[PDB]
């Protein structure tokens, strides 16, 4: 066996952003940025033809909700795209057709930023300001809704994924 190396640290905390107009200075409270580089996940009903082409774009980088606690607690258009550390969080998401696999630098670690006592701490979220370019989306597995399992023979890799570590 072999021990794992550390992660490349990018200088720009929103290097991964699909929409660079995001204003890092407006993020509240003070963000604690993720410095690890393991696979993250996103439940999304949008199909891979769209996500692989566009990446994950945020709803509103201009007038969206930049306060993380507010965005977590009350769903409102925001500059953030939510992801999770938890491969299995898709099992709790009703109706979301796909479990996307993400290999992206950075993101705001929600529980490190607003604590792990809030209602949704169990989501172990990483919030990406400005979203996530397609080159950081590994791929996707569709989810069977009846059993809350991945349809592993129907997973698809993103042709635009660019490994970086």
Numbering used by the authors: 36 to 200
Which sentences from the paper describe this structure?
S. scabies produces a 200-residue, 22-kDa protein that is a single-domain enzyme called Scabin. Scabin has been cloned, expressed, and purified, and shown to harbor dual enzymatic activities (GH and ADP-ribosyltransferase). Scabin targets DNA as a substrate for ADP-ribose modification; it also shows enzyme specificity towards genomic DNA from Solanum tuberosum tubers.
Scabin has some common catalytic features with other members of the mART toxin family. This includes the key Arg (Arg77), which is important for NAD+ binding to the active site; the Ser-Thr-Thr motif (Ser117-Thr118-Thr119), which comprises the scaffold of the NAD+ binding site; and the hallmark catalytic Gln-X-Glu motif (Gln158-X-Glu160). The S-T-S/T motif is known for its role in binding and positioning the NAD+ substrate in CT-like mART toxins.
